[PDB]
Amino acid sequence: NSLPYGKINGTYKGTEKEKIKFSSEGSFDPDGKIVSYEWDFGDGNKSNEENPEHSYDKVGTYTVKLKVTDDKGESSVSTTTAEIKD
Ligand SMILES: [Ca+2]
């Protein structure tokens, strides 16, 4: 099995309470399909949406992780940052 490629499309920028549109566009699996997307927004929150919208209550730089899992149950993880300013 080839592991899937997740594409997390960072880096991200926004202000406090701004709904940041996260995108996994360009993720693929060479020899099957991606069946799940798991996001960790770095503030303790997660999502299983393919392209979640998420806002951050407070200024900061958050580590964002995207785990993609293919039809064989194997996964790969990629990371970026979201920089949230005043
Ligand atoms: Ca695969």
Author numbering: 685 to 770
Q: Can you quote the paper on this entry?
A:
Clostridium histolyticum collagenases ColG and ColH are segmental enzymes that are thought to be activated by Ca2+-triggered domain reorientation to cause extensive tissue destruction. The collagenases consist of a collagenase module (s1), a variable number of polycystic kidney disease-like (PKD-like) domains (s2a and s2b in ColH and s2 in ColG) and a variable number of collagen-binding domains (s3 in ColH and s3a and s3b in ColG). The X-ray crystal structures of Ca2+-bound holo s2a (space group C2), Ca2+-free apo s2a (space group P61), Ca2+-bound holo s2b (space group P21) and two new forms of N-terminally truncated wild-type apo s2 (space groups P21 and P212121) are reported for the first time. Comparison of crystal structures of ColG s2 with crystal structures of ColH s2a and s2b suggests that despite common tertiary folds, PKD-like domains can be grouped into two subsets.
The eight holo s2a molecules are virtually identical (average r.m.s.d. of 0.2 ± 0.1 Å). Along this axis, molecule pairs A and G, B and E, C and F, and D and H are related by NCS translation that results in an off-origin peak that is 63.9% of the origin peak in the Patterson map. The holo and apo structures resemble each other (r.m.s.d. = 0.6 ± 0.2 Å). As expected, the most notable difference between the structures occurs near the N-terminus, where Ca2+ reorients the interacting residues Asn685 and Ser686. One calcium-binding site with a pentagonal bipyramidal geometry was identified near the N-terminus in each domain. Unlike s2b or s2, s2a truncates β-strand A through an approximately 126° rotation of the ψ bond of Ile692. In the s2a structures the termini are the most flexible. As mentioned, the B-factor trends in all holo and apo s2a structures are similar despite the difference in crystal packing.
